[PDB]
Structures are given as C-alpha cells and as structure tokens.
C-alpha cells in the first residue's frame, strides 16, 4: 500500500513547519 516514493514529500511538509 504505502509508497516509498511519497516519504520525502512528508519530510518536506514537515520542514515547512520546523
């Protein structure tokens, strides 16, 4: 299910917080 190619997208959305 979960797509390894999406993981960095999340790492980005995180930074836009931190």
């Amino acid at each position: 299910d979960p797509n390894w190619f999406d993981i960095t997208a999340q790492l980005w959305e995180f930074s836009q917080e931190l």
């Epitope: 797509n3 390894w4 190619f5 999406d6 997208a9």
Partner: antibody
C-alpha cells in the same frame, strides 16, 4: 541544480562483489530520494532500488533482494550500491538518480531529475 | 510488478514532423505517478515529463505529457534534430518502480 559524480569503470569476475559510489554536490542531501538504475548494453533501463539518506530508508526491487545493499553517508553526501554474486548478465552501465524538486530545497517530485554520468561494470571470465 | 509496454518500437520520422509515443501499463499507475525520459547515445537520460503531464523548468515547450491510469502518451509537436534519441516511460506509483523497454525515434531516409 545538483551534480552527481560516480566512481569509475570497474572490471569484475563472476562470483565477486561490486560497490559503486555516487557523490552529490549542490542543494541538500539527506531528504531527497536516490535510486540506482542500470542499463545493459543495447538494452533498456532497469530500476534496482533506492535510499533516503535520512534514517537510511531503503527500498529494493524484489529481483535483487539478497544480492543488493544500498547505503548513504551524510557527511560526504555520497550514496553507495553494493551488488554481489555477480554474473556476466550483470554487465551494464550503472546510474545513480536523485529526486527532482519543484520551482533546490523545493518540494520533491519523486521522478528523477538528476543523473550521475554512469559506471560501466563488466563481469567476465 | 507493473509492466510498461511501449509502442511503437521504432518511430521513423523527418525533422519538423510530429511524434506520438505510447506507454501501456499492465495495471493502473498509482496517483498518475508516471514520468518520461530522453536518452541520447552515451548520455545519461534526461527528465522531460513528471506526474504524467508536468514539465520541469528548462524542458522544451514542444514536449507534452498526457493520460491517466493505464494509457499514457508523450507527444512532440515539432521534431527538432536534437530529439532523435531513445525515450523511456517510468512509473513510481508504488514502491516497486519499473521502466518501459523504450522507443527508438530515428531519422527516416
């Protein structure tokens, strides 16, 4: 925005191991996905696996599982592909490939915007 | 594992003409995560189209991506000489990414 340089051409015998280096310069290294894509001569591209250096999150194509190891070194912005149990069928040019970004520290796009120059590995006896 | 079958194997056209390249995926591509790449002899491949129809900065206007699910098309509107290369499609909609066998676009005559 990013330059990747790979280690040089290498000559191996069957049953041995190869490790190819890909060094990254420009932008930031840790949070963009880097894949290895090889190409046998005269034939087409094949995705082998990849890594996210932050936490070394790996992902391997099933047909290489058990023979392949991908590692990333954050202080040198360098990723490594290790392929063992080599056979002549493994003769090919090996490429490192890194995620693109939108708009260098921009949103990753998944697809491969940045390539290394390639590394021919020949396996023969 | 998703198979990406590319059609036709060998496009033979003249400079200034139009190239329509097909990519057929054996299952639906997750989130339309499909890319197109150009490769000239001895060179590393180059990203043309990402997310099915998006275009990276620096990529030429004449290139266009389209499609959804299982059929995708890469179009070139006005073939420049610098376009006679090999073209690959790629899916990254699931962890296991695959490439197509590629289409040779060669100068006819």
């Amino acid at each position: 925005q990013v330059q990747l340089v790979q280690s040089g051409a290498e000559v191996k015998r069957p049953g041995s191991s190869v490790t190819v280096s890909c060094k990254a310069s420009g932008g930031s290294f840790s949070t963009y996905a880097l894949s290895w894509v090889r190409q046998a001569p005269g034939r087409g591209l094949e995705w082998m696996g990849g890594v996210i250096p932050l936490l070394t999150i790996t992902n391997y194509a099933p047909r290489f599982q058990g023979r392949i190891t991908i590692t990333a070194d954050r202080s040198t912005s360098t990723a490594y592909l290790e392929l063992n149990s080599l056979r002549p069928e493994d003769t090919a040019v090996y490429y490192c490939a890194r995620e693109g970004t939108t708009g260098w520290l921009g949103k990753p796009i998944g697809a491969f915007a940045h390539w290394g120059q390639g590394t021919l590995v020949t396996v023969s006896s | 594992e998703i198979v990406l079958t590319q059609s036709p194997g060998t496009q033979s056209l003249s400079p200034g003409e139009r190239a329509t390249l097909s990519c057929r995926a054996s299952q639906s591509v997750g989130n339309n995560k499909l890319a197109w790449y150009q490769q000239r002899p001895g060179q590393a491949p180059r990203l043309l189209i990402y997310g099915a129809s998006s275009r990276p900065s620096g990529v030429a206007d004449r290139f266009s991506g389209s499609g959804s699910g299982t059929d995708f098309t890469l179009t070139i509107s006005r073939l420049e000489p610098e376009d006679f290369a090999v073209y690959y499609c790629q899916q990254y909609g699931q962890s296991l990414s695959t490439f197509g066998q590629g289409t040779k676009v060669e100068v006819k005559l």
